[PDB]
Amino acid sequence: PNVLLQNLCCRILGKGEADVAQQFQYAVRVIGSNFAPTVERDEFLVTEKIKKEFVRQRREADGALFSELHRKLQSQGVLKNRWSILYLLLSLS
């Protein structure tokens, strides 16, 4: 938990292990107050949102492909909290 959270600050900022302290406290607080998901778990809602977004930009070809790739992510059977990851990518577009 802690180590991963720290490594993230370290990596994106491109600064070393004890140089991330101030951000490290901000993330721990933001994470600490809203640690767990507050919204229902439902993969389907996110896939539809990601597909409306492509529709919205008329990048429909990238949308069609995105469905193939999402199906591929599911079929491999490796992840379990697929929704969260996809929601995190979508939020970051």
């Binding site: 229902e40 439902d42 389907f44 809602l45 539809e48």
Partner: protein, 134 residues
């Protein structure tokens, strides 16, 4: 289409969840309030009034009506700015080129010298008469 995505959330809850009378009421209620607003625009058209330009007028008055409750103000706002996109086409074809092309009549100003062009009171744009004679 955005409505229908809400109903499968309910199929997912029948997958994993349990019966609740209130999981229906308290999920449905943000969207049944959108439905009744959207049904009142639609029952005013079902009565056989209005034809095209004054639909837009009634719908504009209604966007001005809904001011107070800011949630469904946005819902009547999305109708009135996506609805007014074909109207503001022929607006711009008329104020910038002076050529009036309609498949039926969508825009009030009707063909048929100093050149006489009649207008109807069947159809009137969203903002009233002082801008319409200009």
């Amino acid at each position: 289409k955005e409505y229908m995505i809400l109903i499968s959330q309910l199929e997912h809850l029948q997958r994993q969840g349990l019966l609740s009378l209130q999981k229906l009421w308290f999920y449905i209620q943000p969207t049944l309030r959108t439905m009744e607003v959207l049904a009142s625009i639609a029952t005013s058209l079902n009565k056989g009034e209005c034809f095209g330009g004054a639909t837009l007028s009634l719908l504009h008055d209604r966007t001005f009506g809904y001011t107070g409750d800011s949630q469904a103000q946005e819902l009547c706002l999305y109708l009135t700015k996506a609805a007014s996109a074909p109207y503001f086409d022929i607006l711009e074809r008329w104020i910038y080129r002076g050529i009036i092309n309609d498949p039926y009549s969508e825009f009030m100003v009707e063909e048929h010298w100093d050149q006489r062009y009649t207008i109807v009171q069947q159809q009137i744009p969203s903002f009233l008469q002082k801008v319409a004679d200009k």
